[PDB]
Coordinates of C-alpha atoms in Angstrom, one line a residue:
Chain A
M288 CA 24.9 1.8 -8.9
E289 CA 26.1 4.8 -10.9
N290 CA 28.9 6.5 -9.1
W291 CA 28.0 10.2 -9.3
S292 CA 31.5 11.0 -8.1
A293 CA 32.6 9.9 -11.5
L294 CA 30.3 12.5 -13.0
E295 CA 31.2 15.2 -10.5
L296 CA 34.9 14.8 -11.1
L297 CA 35.5 14.0 -14.8
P298 CA 35.7 16.9 -17.3
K299 CA 32.5 17.1 -19.2
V300 CA 31.3 18.5 -22.5
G301 CA 29.8 22.0 -22.6
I302 CA 26.2 21.8 -23.8
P303 CA 23.4 24.4 -23.9
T304 CA 20.9 22.1 -22.2
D305 CA 17.5 23.3 -23.4
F306 CA 14.3 21.6 -22.6
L307 CA 10.9 23.2 -22.4
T308 CA 9.7 22.3 -18.9
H309 CA 11.3 23.4 -15.6
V310 CA 14.2 21.3 -14.3
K311 CA 12.6 20.4 -11.0
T312 CA 9.3 19.8 -12.9
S313 CA 11.0 17.3 -15.1
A314 CA 12.8 15.9 -12.1
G315 CA 10.1 15.2 -9.5
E316 CA 7.6 14.0 -12.2
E317 CA 10.2 11.5 -13.1
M318 CA 10.8 11.9 -16.8
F319 CA 14.2 10.3 -16.4
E320 CA 15.4 6.9 -15.1
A321 CA 17.8 7.9 -12.3
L322 CA 18.3 11.2 -10.5
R323 CA 20.9 12.5 -8.1
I324 CA 20.0 15.8 -6.4
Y325 CA 21.7 17.5 -3.5
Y326 CA 20.6 20.9 -2.3
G327 CA 23.8 21.9 -0.6
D328 CA 27.5 21.2 -1.4
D329 CA 27.7 17.5 -1.1
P330 CA 31.3 16.4 -0.2
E331 CA 30.7 12.8 -1.4
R332 CA 32.6 13.6 -4.6
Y333 CA 35.8 14.4 -2.7
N334 CA 36.7 10.9 -1.3
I335 CA 38.0 8.3 -3.8
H336 CA 38.7 4.6 -3.3
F337 CA 40.9 2.2 -5.0
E338 CA 41.5 -1.6 -5.2
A339 CA 45.2 -1.5 -6.0
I340 CA 45.8 -4.5 -8.2
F341 CA 49.5 -4.5 -7.9
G342 CA 50.7 -7.5 -9.9
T343 CA 49.4 -10.6 -11.8
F344 CA 51.8 -13.5 -11.4
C345 CA 52.0 -16.5 -13.6
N346 CA 54.2 -19.5 -12.8
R347 CA 57.5 -20.4 -14.4
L348 CA 57.9 -24.1 -14.3
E349 CA 61.4 -25.6 -14.0
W350 CA 62.2 -27.3 -17.3
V351 CA 63.6 -30.5 -15.8
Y352 CA 64.7 -33.0 -18.5
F353 CA 66.0 -36.5 -18.4
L354 CA 69.6 -35.9 -19.2
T355 CA 69.7 -32.7 -17.1
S356 CA 69.0 -34.9 -14.0
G357 CA 71.9 -36.9 -12.6
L358 CA 69.6 -40.0 -12.5
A359 CA 70.5 -40.4 -16.2
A360 CA 74.0 -41.4 -15.0
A361 CA 72.5 -44.9 -14.3
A362 CA 70.7 -44.7 -17.6
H363 CA 71.8 -45.2 -21.2
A364 CA 69.2 -43.2 -23.1
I365 CA 68.9 -44.3 -26.7
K366 CA 66.2 -43.1 -29.2
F367 CA 64.9 -45.7 -31.5
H368 CA 62.0 -44.7 -33.8
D369 CA 60.7 -48.2 -34.6
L370 CA 60.3 -49.2 -30.9
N371 CA 56.6 -50.1 -31.1
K372 CA 57.3 -52.7 -33.8
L373 CA 59.4 -55.0 -31.5
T374 CA 58.2 -57.5 -29.0
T375 CA 61.2 -57.8 -26.7
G376 CA 64.9 -57.4 -26.7
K377 CA 66.9 -60.4 -25.5
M378 CA 70.6 -60.4 -24.7
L379 CA 72.9 -63.5 -24.8
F380 CA 76.1 -64.2 -22.8
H381 CA 78.6 -67.1 -23.1
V382 CA 81.0 -67.7 -20.2
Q383 CA 83.4 -70.6 -19.8
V384 CA 84.8 -70.7 -16.3
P385 CA 88.3 -70.0 -15.1
Chain B
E1071 CA 38.2 12.6 24.4
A1072 CA 36.2 14.0 21.5
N1073 CA 37.2 12.3 18.3
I1074 CA 36.5 8.5 18.8
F1075 CA 38.3 6.0 16.6
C1076 CA 36.5 2.8 15.7
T1077 CA 37.8 -0.1 13.6
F1078 CA 36.7 -3.2 11.7
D1079 CA 37.7 -6.8 12.0
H1080 CA 36.5 -7.4 8.5
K1081 CA 37.7 -5.8 5.3
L1082 CA 35.3 -3.5 3.4
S1083 CA 34.9 -3.8 -0.3
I1084 CA 34.1 -0.9 -2.6
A1085 CA 30.3 -1.5 -2.0
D1086 CA 30.7 -1.3 1.7
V1087 CA 32.7 1.9 1.7
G1088 CA 30.3 3.2 -0.9
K1089 CA 27.3 2.7 1.4
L1090 CA 29.3 4.0 4.3
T1091 CA 30.2 7.2 2.6
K1092 CA 26.6 8.2 2.3
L1093 CA 26.2 7.8 6.1
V1094 CA 28.1 11.0 7.0
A1095 CA 26.6 13.1 9.8
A1096 CA 24.4 10.3 10.9
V1097 CA 24.0 9.8 14.7
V1098 CA 25.0 6.4 16.1
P1099 CA 24.8 5.3 19.7
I1100 CA 27.9 4.4 21.7
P1101 CA 27.5 2.8 25.1
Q1102 CA 31.0 3.4 26.5
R1103 CA 32.2 7.0 25.8
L1104 CA 35.8 5.6 25.3
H1105 CA 38.4 6.2 22.7
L1106 CA 39.8 3.1 21.0
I1107 CA 36.4 1.3 20.5
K1108 CA 35.3 -1.7 18.5
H1109 CA 32.5 -2.1 15.9
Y1110 CA 30.5 -4.9 17.5
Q1111 CA 29.2 -2.6 20.2
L1112 CA 28.8 0.2 17.7
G1113 CA 25.1 0.8 16.9
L1114 CA 22.2 -1.1 18.4
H1115 CA 23.0 -4.5 17.0
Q1116 CA 24.4 -5.9 20.2
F1117 CA 21.4 -4.5 22.1
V1118 CA 18.5 -5.3 19.6
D1119 CA 16.4 -8.2 20.7
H1120 CA 13.0 -9.0 19.3
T1121 CA 10.4 -10.3 21.8
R1122 CA 12.4 -8.7 24.7
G1123 CA 10.8 -5.2 25.1
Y1124 CA 10.7 -2.0 23.1
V1125 CA 10.8 -0.1 26.4
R1126 CA 14.1 -1.8 27.4
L1127 CA 15.6 -0.6 24.1
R1128 CA 14.1 2.8 24.8
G1129 CA 15.6 3.1 28.2
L1130 CA 19.0 1.9 27.3
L1131 CA 19.1 4.1 24.2
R1132 CA 18.2 7.2 26.2
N1133 CA 20.9 6.0 28.6
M1134 CA 23.3 5.5 25.7
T1135 CA 25.7 8.1 24.4
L1136 CA 25.3 9.6 21.0
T1137 CA 27.9 10.5 18.4
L1138 CA 28.2 11.7 14.8
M1139 CA 29.5 9.6 11.9
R1140 CA 32.1 11.4 9.7
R1141 CA 35.0 10.6 7.4
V1142 CA 35.6 6.9 6.8
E1143 CA 38.8 6.2 5.0
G1144 CA 39.0 2.4 4.9
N1145 CA 39.0 0.3 8.1
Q1146 CA 38.5 3.6 10.1
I1147 CA 35.4 5.4 11.2
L1148 CA 36.2 8.6 13.2
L1149 CA 33.2 9.0 15.4
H1150 CA 32.9 12.4 16.9
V1151 CA 30.7 13.1 19.9
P1152 CA 28.8 16.4 19.4
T1153 CA 29.5 19.0 22.0
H1154 CA 26.7 20.5 24.0
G1155 CA 25.4 23.7 22.4
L1156 CA 27.2 24.1 19.1
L1157 CA 25.4 23.8 15.8
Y1158 CA 25.9 20.5 14.0
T1159 CA 24.3 18.8 11.0
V1160 CA 22.4 15.5 10.9
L1161 CA 21.3 13.1 8.2
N1162 CA 18.4 10.8 9.1
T1163 CA 17.1 7.8 7.2
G1164 CA 14.0 7.4 9.3
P1165 CA 11.0 7.8 6.9
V1166 CA 9.5 10.7 8.8
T1167 CA 9.3 14.3 7.6
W1168 CA 10.9 17.1 9.6
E1169 CA 10.4 20.8 10.3
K1170 CA 12.7 23.9 10.6
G1171 CA 11.2 24.8 13.9
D1172 CA 10.5 21.8 16.1
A1173 CA 12.8 19.7 18.3
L1174 CA 14.0 16.1 18.1
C1175 CA 14.3 12.9 20.2
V1176 CA 16.0 9.6 19.6
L1177 CA 13.9 6.4 19.6
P1178 CA 14.5 2.8 18.7
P1179 CA 13.3 2.3 15.1
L1180 CA 10.0 0.8 14.1
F1181 CA 9.2 -1.1 11.0
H1182 CA 7.6 1.3 8.4
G1183 CA 5.7 -1.4 6.5
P1184 CA 7.6 -1.9 3.3
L1185 CA 10.0 -4.0 5.5
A1186 CA 13.3 -3.3 3.8
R1187 CA 15.5 -4.6 6.7
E1188 CA 18.6 -3.3 4.9
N1189 CA 20.2 -0.3 6.6
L1190 CA 23.1 -0.4 4.1
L1191 CA 25.7 -2.1 6.3
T1192 CA 26.2 -5.8 7.0
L1193 CA 29.4 -7.6 8.1
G1194 CA 28.7 -11.4 8.1
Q1195 CA 26.1 -12.0 10.8
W1196 CA 26.6 -8.5 12.1
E1197 CA 24.4 -5.7 10.8
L1198 CA 23.9 -2.0 11.5
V1199 CA 20.6 -0.8 13.0
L1200 CA 20.2 3.0 13.3
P1201 CA 18.1 4.7 16.0
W1202 CA 15.2 6.7 14.5
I1203 CA 15.4 10.5 14.9
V1204 CA 11.8 11.6 15.5
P1205 CA 10.3 15.0 15.9
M1206 CA 9.1 15.9 19.4
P1207 CA 5.3 15.5 19.1
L1208 CA 5.5 12.1 17.5
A1209 CA 8.1 11.1 20.2
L1210 CA 5.8 12.1 23.1
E1211 CA 2.8 10.5 21.2
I1212 CA 4.5 7.1 20.9
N1213 CA 5.7 7.4 24.5
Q1214 CA 2.2 8.1 25.8
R1215 CA 0.7 5.4 23.5
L1216 CA 3.0 2.7 24.8
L1217 CA 2.2 4.0 28.3
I1218 CA -1.6 3.6 27.6
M1219 CA -0.8 0.1 26.2
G1220 CA 1.0 -0.9 29.4
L1221 CA -1.5 0.8 31.7
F1222 CA -4.7 -0.5 30.1
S1223 CA -3.8 -4.1 29.2
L1224 CA -3.4 -5.6 32.7
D1225 CA -5.7 -8.4 33.7
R1226 CA -7.4 -8.7 30.3
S1227 CA -7.7 -11.6 27.9
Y1228 CA -6.1 -11.4 24.5
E1229 CA -9.1 -10.5 22.4
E1230 CA -10.1 -7.2 24.0
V1231 CA -6.6 -5.9 24.1
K1232 CA -6.1 -7.1 20.5
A1233 CA -9.1 -5.1 19.4
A1234 CA -7.6 -2.1 21.4
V1235 CA -4.1 -2.3 20.0
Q1236 CA -4.9 -3.0 16.3
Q1237 CA -6.1 0.7 16.3
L1238 CA -3.8 1.8 19.1
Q1239 CA -0.4 0.7 17.6
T1240 CA -1.1 2.6 14.4
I1241 CA 0.0 6.3 14.3
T1242 CA -0.5 8.5 11.2
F1243 CA 1.9 11.4 11.6
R1244 CA 2.2 13.8 8.7
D1245 CA 1.2 11.3 6.0
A1246 CA 3.2 8.4 7.5
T1247 CA 1.9 5.4 9.3
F1248 CA 3.9 3.7 12.1
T1249 CA 3.3 0.6 14.3
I1250 CA 5.0 -0.5 17.5
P1251 CA 6.6 -3.9 17.2
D1252 CA 7.2 -5.2 20.8
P1253 CA 4.7 -3.8 23.3
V1254 CA 5.5 -6.6 25.9
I1255 CA 5.2 -5.6 29.5
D1256 CA 8.3 -4.9 31.7
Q1257 CA 9.2 -4.6 35.3
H1258 CA 10.6 -1.2 34.3
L1259 CA 7.2 -0.5 32.7
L1260 CA 5.6 -1.6 36.0
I1261 CA 7.6 1.0 37.9
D1262 CA 6.4 3.5 35.3
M1263 CA 2.8 2.5 36.0
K1264 CA 3.6 2.8 39.7
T1265 CA 4.8 6.4 39.4
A1266 CA 1.8 7.0 37.2
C1267 CA -0.7 5.7 39.7
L1268 CA 0.9 7.5 42.6
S1269 CA 1.0 10.8 40.7
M1270 CA -2.6 10.6 39.6
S1271 CA -3.7 9.6 43.1
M1272 CA -1.8 12.7 44.4
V1273 CA -3.5 15.0 41.9
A1274 CA -6.8 13.4 42.8
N1275 CA -6.1 14.2 46.5
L1276 CA -4.8 17.7 46.8
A1277 CA -6.9 19.2 43.9
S1278 CA -9.2 22.0 44.9
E1279 CA -12.9 21.3 45.6
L1280 CA -13.9 23.9 43.0
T1281 CA -11.8 22.3 40.3
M1282 CA -13.5 19.0 41.0
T1283 CA -16.8 20.7 40.1
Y1284 CA -15.5 23.3 37.6
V1285 CA -16.6 21.5 34.4
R1286 CA -20.1 21.1 35.9
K1287 CA -20.2 24.9 36.2
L1288 CA -18.9 25.5 32.7
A1289 CA -21.4 22.9 31.5
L1290 CA -24.3 24.7 33.1
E1291 CA -23.0 28.1 31.8
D1292 CA -21.9 27.6 28.2
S1293 CA -22.3 25.0 25.4
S1294 CA -19.4 24.6 23.0
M1295 CA -18.4 21.7 20.8
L1296 CA -15.4 20.6 22.8
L1297 CA -17.6 21.4 25.8
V1298 CA -20.2 19.1 24.4
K1299 CA -17.6 16.4 24.1
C1300 CA -16.4 17.1 27.6
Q1301 CA -19.9 16.9 29.0
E1302 CA -20.4 13.6 27.1
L1303 CA -17.2 12.2 28.7
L1304 CA -17.8 13.6 32.2
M1305 CA -21.5 12.6 32.4
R1306 CA -20.7 9.1 31.0
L1307 CA -18.0 8.8 33.8
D1308 CA -20.6 10.1 36.3
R1309 CA -23.2 7.5 35.3
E1310 CA -20.5 4.9 35.4
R1311 CA -19.9 6.2 38.9
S1312 CA -23.4 7.0 40.0
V1313 CA -26.9 6.8 38.5
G1314 CA -28.0 9.7 40.7
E1315 CA -28.3 13.3 39.4
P1316 CA -25.1 15.3 39.9
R1317 CA -26.2 18.3 42.0
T1318 CA -25.6 21.9 41.1
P1319 CA -22.8 23.8 42.9
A1320 CA -23.4 26.7 45.2
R1321 CA -21.2 29.4 46.7
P1322 CA -17.9 27.7 47.7
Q1323 CA -17.1 28.2 51.4
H1324 CA -13.4 27.6 51.7
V1325 CA -12.1 30.5 49.5
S1326 CA -8.5 31.3 50.4
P1327 CA -5.9 32.6 47.9
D1328 CA -2.8 31.2 49.6
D1329 CA -4.5 27.9 49.9
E1330 CA -5.1 27.7 46.1
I1331 CA -1.6 28.9 45.5
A1332 CA -0.1 26.2 47.7
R1333 CA -2.2 23.3 46.6
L1334 CA -2.0 24.2 42.9
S1335 CA 1.8 24.6 43.2
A1336 CA 2.0 21.1 44.7
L1337 CA -0.4 20.0 42.0
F1338 CA 1.9 21.5 39.3
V1339 CA 4.8 19.6 40.9
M1340 CA 2.9 16.4 40.7
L1341 CA 1.9 17.0 37.1
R1342 CA 5.6 17.5 36.3
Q1343 CA 6.3 14.2 38.1
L1344 CA 3.7 12.5 35.9
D1345 CA 4.7 14.2 32.7
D1346 CA 8.4 13.4 33.0
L1347 CA 7.5 9.8 32.3
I1348 CA 6.5 10.6 28.7
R1349 CA 8.1 14.1 28.2
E1350 CA 11.6 13.3 26.9
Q1351 CA 14.2 16.0 27.0
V1352 CA 15.2 17.3 23.6
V1353 CA 18.3 16.2 21.6
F1354 CA 18.3 18.5 18.6
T1355 CA 16.9 22.0 17.9
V1356 CA 16.5 22.7 14.2
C1357 CA 18.2 25.6 12.6
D1358 CA 17.6 24.5 9.0
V1359 CA 16.0 21.5 7.1
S1360 CA 17.1 20.3 3.7
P1361 CA 14.4 20.5 1.0
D1362 CA 14.7 16.8 0.2
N1363 CA 14.1 16.0 3.9
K1364 CA 17.3 14.0 4.2
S1365 CA 19.6 16.2 6.1
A1366 CA 19.3 19.1 8.6
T1367 CA 21.3 21.6 10.7
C1368 CA 20.4 21.3 14.3
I1369 CA 21.7 23.3 17.3
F1370 CA 22.9 21.1 20.1
Chain C
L617 CA 78.3 -5.3 36.3
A618 CA 79.9 -2.8 33.9
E619 CA 77.0 -2.3 31.5
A620 CA 74.5 -2.1 34.3
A621 CA 75.4 1.5 35.2
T622 CA 73.7 4.2 33.2
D623 CA 75.7 6.9 31.4
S624 CA 76.6 10.3 32.7
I625 CA 74.9 13.3 31.3
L626 CA 78.1 15.1 30.2
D627 CA 81.1 13.2 28.9
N628 CA 84.1 14.9 27.4
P629 CA 85.3 12.5 24.7
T630 CA 88.7 14.2 24.5
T631 CA 89.4 13.5 28.2
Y632 CA 90.4 10.1 29.5
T633 CA 91.2 8.5 26.2
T634 CA 94.0 5.9 26.1
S635 CA 96.6 5.2 23.5
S636 CA 95.4 3.5 20.3
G637 CA 92.2 5.5 20.4
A638 CA 90.4 3.4 22.9
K639 CA 87.9 5.3 25.1
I640 CA 87.2 4.7 28.8
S641 CA 83.7 3.8 29.9
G642 CA 84.3 3.6 33.6
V643 CA 86.5 2.7 36.5
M644 CA 86.3 -0.1 39.1
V645 CA 88.2 -0.6 42.2
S646 CA 88.8 -3.4 44.8
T647 CA 91.5 -4.0 47.4
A648 CA 94.9 -5.5 46.6
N649 CA 93.8 -9.1 47.4
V650 CA 90.9 -9.2 45.0
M651 CA 92.9 -7.2 42.5
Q652 CA 95.7 -9.8 42.6
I653 CA 93.2 -12.6 42.2
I654 CA 91.6 -10.9 39.1
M655 CA 95.1 -10.1 37.7
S656 CA 96.1 -13.8 38.0
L657 CA 92.7 -14.9 36.7
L658 CA 91.8 -12.7 33.7
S659 CA 95.2 -11.7 32.4
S660 CA 94.3 -12.2 28.7
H661 CA 91.8 -9.3 29.0
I662 CA 94.1 -7.0 31.0
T663 CA 96.5 -4.5 29.3
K664 CA 98.9 -2.1 30.7
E665 CA 98.8 1.1 28.6
Chain D
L865 CA 39.8 -7.6 -28.5
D866 CA 39.7 -10.2 -31.4
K867 CA 43.5 -9.9 -31.6
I868 CA 43.6 -10.4 -27.8
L869 CA 41.5 -13.5 -28.1
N870 CA 43.7 -14.8 -30.9
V871 CA 46.9 -14.3 -29.0
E872 CA 45.3 -15.8 -25.9
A873 CA 44.3 -18.9 -28.0
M874 CA 47.9 -19.1 -29.3
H875 CA 49.3 -18.8 -25.8
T876 CA 47.0 -21.3 -24.2
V877 CA 47.9 -23.8 -26.9
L878 CA 51.6 -23.0 -26.4
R879 CA 51.3 -23.2 -22.6
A880 CA 49.5 -26.5 -22.8
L881 CA 52.2 -27.9 -25.2
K882 CA 55.0 -26.8 -22.8
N883 CA 53.2 -28.2 -19.8
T884 CA 52.6 -31.5 -21.7
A885 CA 56.3 -31.8 -22.6
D886 CA 57.3 -31.1 -19.0
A887 CA 54.8 -33.7 -17.8
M888 CA 56.3 -36.2 -20.4
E889 CA 59.8 -35.5 -19.0
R890 CA 58.7 -36.0 -15.4
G891 CA 56.8 -39.1 -16.3
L892 CA 59.9 -40.5 -18.1
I893 CA 61.9 -39.9 -15.0
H894 CA 59.2 -41.4 -12.8
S895 CA 58.8 -44.6 -15.0
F896 CA 62.6 -45.0 -15.1
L897 CA 62.7 -44.7 -11.3
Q898 CA 59.9 -47.3 -11.0
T899 CA 61.7 -49.7 -13.3
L900 CA 64.9 -49.1 -11.4
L901 CA 63.4 -49.7 -7.9
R902 CA 61.5 -52.8 -9.0
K903 CA 64.7 -54.8 -9.3
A904 CA 66.9 -53.4 -6.6
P905 CA 67.3 -55.7 -3.6
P906 CA 67.6 -54.1 -0.1
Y907 CA 71.0 -53.4 1.6
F908 CA 71.0 -56.4 3.9
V909 CA 70.7 -58.9 0.9
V910 CA 73.7 -57.6 -1.0
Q911 CA 75.7 -57.0 2.2
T912 CA 75.0 -60.6 3.1
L913 CA 75.9 -61.8 -0.4
Chain E
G1474 CA 70.2 20.4 37.5
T1475 CA 70.7 20.6 33.7
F1476 CA 68.3 19.3 31.1
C1477 CA 68.1 15.7 29.8
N1478 CA 70.3 16.7 26.8
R1479 CA 71.6 13.2 26.1
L1480 CA 68.8 12.2 23.7
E1481 CA 69.7 10.3 20.5
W1482 CA 67.9 9.2 17.3
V1483 CA 67.2 6.0 15.3
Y1484 CA 66.2 5.5 11.7
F1485 CA 64.3 2.7 9.9
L1486 CA 66.7 1.9 7.1
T1487 CA 69.7 2.0 9.5
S1488 CA 68.1 -0.9 11.3
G1489 CA 68.4 -4.4 9.8
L1490 CA 64.7 -5.0 10.3
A1491 CA 64.3 -3.4 6.9
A1492 CA 65.9 -6.5 5.4
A1493 CA 62.6 -8.1 6.2
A1494 CA 60.8 -5.2 4.4
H1495 CA 60.5 -3.6 1.0
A1496 CA 59.9 0.0 2.0
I1497 CA 57.7 1.9 -0.4
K1498 CA 56.6 5.5 -0.1
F1499 CA 53.2 6.3 -1.7
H1500 CA 51.2 9.3 -0.7
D1501 CA 47.6 8.0 -1.1
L1502 CA 47.0 5.3 1.5
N1503 CA 44.1 7.4 2.9
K1504 CA 42.4 7.1 -0.6
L1505 CA 43.3 3.4 -0.7
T1506 CA 40.9 0.6 0.4
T1507 CA 42.6 -2.7 -0.2
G1508 CA 45.8 -3.8 -1.9
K1509 CA 45.6 -7.2 -3.7
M1510 CA 48.0 -9.4 -5.6
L1511 CA 46.5 -12.3 -7.5
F1512 CA 48.6 -15.3 -8.6
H1513 CA 48.0 -17.7 -11.4
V1514 CA 49.7 -21.1 -11.4
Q1515 CA 49.5 -24.2 -13.6
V1516 CA 50.5 -27.4 -12.0
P1517 CA 53.0 -29.9 -13.5

């Protein structure tokens, strides 16, 4: 619904409004699409309401990495670009006893 | 004391405060006459009950207190009870025209027929229903019509009273048609019928013997159109009473001025006792009416 | 017991101050027996000044 | 508004890439922790041994 | 007797309860309906 307070409060443009019929004759016979007529001094323009959107808040995620964590102390992080071309990595050890 | 603060458990959006800000100087009923009040007992929504009795709503509303709606500011209402005597302004939404000169009464609202059922306030299940402000002749007309509905309809099957009330519930008052929703009989309505029957029995008893035959005298003297209708009504009542010829009256013997004064003063007392069933006291006396018939200035 | 009593209306702050700027709130009194018992009991919180 | 939609497209692509990289890091930590826990005996085993 | 002249005063910001608050003076609450803060968050 059209807030007529926004019309009653905003500065308008001065126009010599000239139409041939009377104003009320154009009004009550409904030449237009929406009217707003008060015969007194309507105080409905004087009270204004807000919604007060204070702040929009995105999230900042903590940029936790592998080597930033202390759990990498038990790890030995190597980067090897041809990793998908291997099957398995075996390790051999030879001990003779004391 | 005077300014009564109400609240809301629910938040109002911009739409709710927008439709509240066009309700300034509307009269709302308050049952308590207290200061820090709550919104569920505000209005008639706690008291409205379909299939319970219009006359119950009428009696509780005429027992309820009235106040004026001014200056919402967000979760606050600021009801102000009108003082007795000083000029105030009112804004009615009841689709009934007004007049600069007549008086007002406050009635529980009827359905107009378009059936909007939106009085521009709803909080969840809770809604706001506004009491209709009605000009005095329509008010006493609907009061007397519900009284005839309660008085006539006893010990009758549904078809004859249905044929009565399809044309009795409708009232065309100044190019506006209204119908009464809940005409259901009440024990309170039974005590109204009790006062009605006792009052009409008393005005049957202590009426003068010349007034019991006065319309026969005016019938034999003069013939006018309303007199023709009155003779039709009275002679039909006579032939429903007696098929014999109603005799002409002669010189009345018991002529005594103090007797007529005393018995007709008691008669006027009893007619006051009968009329105060339907004659409601006023609530607003119009100083001015707005040309769009939305608002008015009334002195009370 | 001490803080239970309410204040006086007029209190001259210049009067009845001790050395080292400490100010007197009130005065309590017993006999010599109870006084000697308290003096032997709470001597860390007692000061002659 | 076309510039606003373009910078919004750039920022949702950038935000999705940053969230994907963070999810990759968390998943690397998670998979390392799973592979670590899948071979650790409980305390009573090694304390007995 | 004399008047109850021993009255004293208390302030808001002198109290430590303002540590739970963020005091803001703004002269249009009567023209204010609601105050909203809306938060956006992506999940990791």
